Amino acid sequence: SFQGIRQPVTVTELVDSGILRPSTVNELESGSYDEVGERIKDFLQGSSCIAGIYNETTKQKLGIYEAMKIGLVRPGTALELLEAQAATGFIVDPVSNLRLPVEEAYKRGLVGIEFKEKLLSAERAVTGYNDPETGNIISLFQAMNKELIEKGHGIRLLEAQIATGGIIDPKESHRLPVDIAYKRGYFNEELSEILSDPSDDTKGFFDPNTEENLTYLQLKERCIKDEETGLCLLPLKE
Amino acid sequence: SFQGIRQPVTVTELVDSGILRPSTVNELESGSYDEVGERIKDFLQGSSCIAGIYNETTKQKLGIYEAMKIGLVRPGTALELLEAQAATGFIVDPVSNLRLPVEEAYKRGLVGIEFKEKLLSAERAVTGYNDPETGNIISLFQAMNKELIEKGHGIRLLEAQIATGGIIDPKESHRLPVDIAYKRGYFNEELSEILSDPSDDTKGFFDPNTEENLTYLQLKERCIKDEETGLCLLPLKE
């Protein structure tokens, strides 16, 4: 029925997901559909992330890669935002307002050849990883529980997702309330505590201006919204 | 130890609350406290609400009551924002940057004599209502389950709270993760669904500009942040 990150989402799947109320279905059959998917938008694909940069100097908006290609953000911090962009679904171009998978983005010149390989791994936190035994699609979380990636790197991707609608379901392709995420084994309370009560390890992202470390949630709120796009933008200088 | 809405909050109470990790406690004996309460701020008192107004005309920021006293917001919508303010803990003065209980606000001239009685009831969704038989402090939720208030009015206050840190615990005086709120009988999934999938019913609040109905979450994102205060402000005109 509705459009998810990659795959379409069934109306049943969302009601089971604790997203839509049993009544709103009896209202779709004998009702609209462009408004329902408009009321439950943040779950289908998610809310805005740090789409681009906006430097006070020229008053222009820029993608993340373009700004590092011209010296306004060191290659280092560029990777983080472009990873958190991948881990939520799509790479973004504020100028044109495009949202696209790593492969498309690379064709369109929105991301470097040097970054492409890493941005192709952080996107598996969207479409799923693979189980060494069984070859079955498992969650980023289940991938941390089987030791296929560092808890610092994995944790950094989970907060990018939680700060833009909730943790994603690999199989169903959409955002999920924290409780359902717990029921389906894709997150837990031990992890919520690490974000609510951050430490010096969980300071994954770096703020260019104030030059300090913080969480996606924290950095994201340091951003300004755009009117014709809505995409949150990180203000910079020089 | 930490400061809550009204009452102080024990370090045990927060760990039980699924808020602080068991390690951060043993790390309170070993070097801070002004930073811990700075990492878990949104729960202690909460995030910003719609504190005031900002009219494009004069470029000034105003409290909600002052704007209706000069004609820039009809008495009707004034009540909504001043109720949602009460139901989150404190009434707000963007100009001076004060946060205060209804009683103090009324002395200070931030709210009218006509509104005082209603703003004194919506604050019970903060400090608790009273159970007829046994006269014990019950949750706003429990007050809805015993028919002491309309589900439309009660629902409108729960979304004001959820959009600013989470539902509040009357007894403990702080915000709570949705799952704990469920465990303690202060919310449920049947209610999350009404917010995630909102209707013409759960549209409680009115936007003066676009002139339409929406949820606190939606209206709040239509707001701009302030630099010296951080309080979200609702932009208007005339």
Output the six-digit token pair for B60. Answer: 């000034």
Method of structure determination? X-ray
Give the 3-state secondary structure of chain A.
CEECCCCEECHHHHHHCCCCCHHHHHCCCCCCCCCHHHHCHHHHCCCCCEEEEEECCCCEEECHHHHHCCCCCCHHHHHHHHHHHHCCCCEEECCCCEEECHHHHHHCCCCCCCCHHHHCCCCHHHHCEECCCCCCEECHHHHHCCCCCCHHHHHHHHHHHHCCCCEEECCCCEEECHHHHHHCCCCCHHHHHHHHCCCCCCCEEEECCCCEEECHHHHHHCCECCCCCCCEEEEECC
Question: What is the domain count for chain A?
Answer: 1
Token pair 């009551």 is found at: B65
Distance CA A43, CA B196 (A): 9
Q: Say which of B19, B179, B197 has its CB closest to residue A20.
A: B197
Contact A39 B198 (CB under 8 A): yes
- Identify whether the C-beta of residue A65 lies closer than 8 Å to the C-beta of residue A82: yes
B236 three-class SS: strand
- Neighbour tally for A22: CB within 10 Å: 9
Distance CA A29, CA A44 (A): 20
Q: Does B196 touch chain A (CB under 8 A)?
A: yes
Residues of A in contact with B19 (CB under 8 A): 193, 196-197
Token pair 């470390």 is found at: A213
Distance CA B51, CA A64 (A): 33
Output the six-digit token pair for A56. Answer: 């006070």
Distance CA B213, CA A143 (A): 43
Residue A155: strand pairing partners: none
Identify the DSSP state of B74: -
Q: Say which of A40, A189, A193 has its CB closest to residue B197.
A: A40
Contact B197 A21 (CB under 8 A): yes
Token pair 């430097």 is found at: A55
CATH code for position A69: 3.90.1290.10
Token pair 């003065």 is found at: B93
Q: What are phi and psi of B27, to 5 degrees?
A: -95, 5
Contact A193 B40 (CB under 8 A): no
Domain coverage including residue B201: 1-238
Chain A residue with the nearest C-alpha to that of B198: A39
How far CA B115 is from CA of B5, B13, B78, B126, B160, in Å, comes to 22, 35, 10, 18, 18
